[PDB]
Amino acid sequence: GLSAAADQTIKIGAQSMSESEIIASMLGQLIEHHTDLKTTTIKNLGSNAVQQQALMNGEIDIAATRYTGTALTGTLRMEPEKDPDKALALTQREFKKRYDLKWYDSYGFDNTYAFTVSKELADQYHLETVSDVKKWAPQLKLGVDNYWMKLKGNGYQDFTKTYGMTFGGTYPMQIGLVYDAVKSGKMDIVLAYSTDGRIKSYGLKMLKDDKQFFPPYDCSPVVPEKVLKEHPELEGIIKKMLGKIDTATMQELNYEVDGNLKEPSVVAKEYLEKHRYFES
Numbered sequence: 001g002l003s004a005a006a007d008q009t010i011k012i013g014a015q016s017m018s019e020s021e022i023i024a025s026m027l028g029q030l031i032e033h034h035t036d037l038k039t040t041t042i043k044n045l046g047s048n049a050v051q052q053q054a055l056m057n058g059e060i061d062i063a064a065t066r067y068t069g070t071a072l073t074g075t076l077r078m079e080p081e082k083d084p085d086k087a088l089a090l091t092q093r094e095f096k097k098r099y100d101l102k103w104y105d106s107y108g109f110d111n112t113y114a115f116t117v118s119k120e121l122a123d124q125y126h127l128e129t130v131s132d133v134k135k136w137a138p139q140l141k142l143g144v145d146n147y148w149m150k151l152k153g154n155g156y157q158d159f160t161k162t163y164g165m166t167f168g169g170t171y172p173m174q175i176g177l178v179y180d181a182v183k184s185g186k187m188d189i190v191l192a193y194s195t196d197g198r199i200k201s202y203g204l205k206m207l208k209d210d211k212q213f214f215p216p217y218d219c220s221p222v223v224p225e226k227v228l229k230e231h232p233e234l235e236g237i238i239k240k241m242l243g244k245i246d247t248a249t250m251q252e253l254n255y256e257v258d259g260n261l262k263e264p265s266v267v268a269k270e271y272l273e274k275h276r277y278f279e280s
């Protein structure tokens, strides 16, 4: 019954990325700061599609981190849109219309796929753009995440068709491993995620996507309208995180987990404390 709503546990989904665990924990702690609601994190969701299904079948009440470009092509099956603001607006409109899901404004950061090399290699061969490695592709070993080879739309197949290059070797691995793979020289180039905290201190260089192959990937929480109706305090709490977390900050938080060996819940807690829970 409705009088039991206050007694329910809010299930917050996290994908298998440090970023998603940090943000899921932050949102849970913020909810507990303001309400008597219990929260839990449903971790290790594999992908955008897994999160989408889990929202529609009640397995998660909030998806902590979704990315506009991924949802536009993968979930909505729409033509890609190059403009970040337009992509977000389209995604918001269609998510409400098709799924009765609220796709919130962004936290303030985007997390894009980015072809990444050591600064040493970039300096030696004057590498600035993806096209700059076209003539080198057969002599390069590329490390990628464990999903990108089969991924539709902005995956390996469409990349080869759009950029007209294939690498001498492709090596799928868990995303977290690619940073050490390129730093150590095992890979010459990797498809990194732009918010990773290791890119800066590992001395890595992200190449410009000069063909604009990759869409915008602004990050937002997504919540079913039914959940918002049953817990009317959630709207105001989620709003407190929006537009407040920039890409440099997200990278720093990711670094705390991956480079400074902190648990995502501790990273989230320390950030909330530093910023006085977003109201000083």
Ligand SMILES: C[N+](C)(C)C[C@H](O)CC(=O)O
Binding pocket: 015, 046, 047, 048, 049, 067, 070, 111, 112, 113, 193, 217
């Ligand atoms: C963040 N980004 C866009 C690099 C990868 C996506 O999260 C992949 C996914 O969510 O399925």
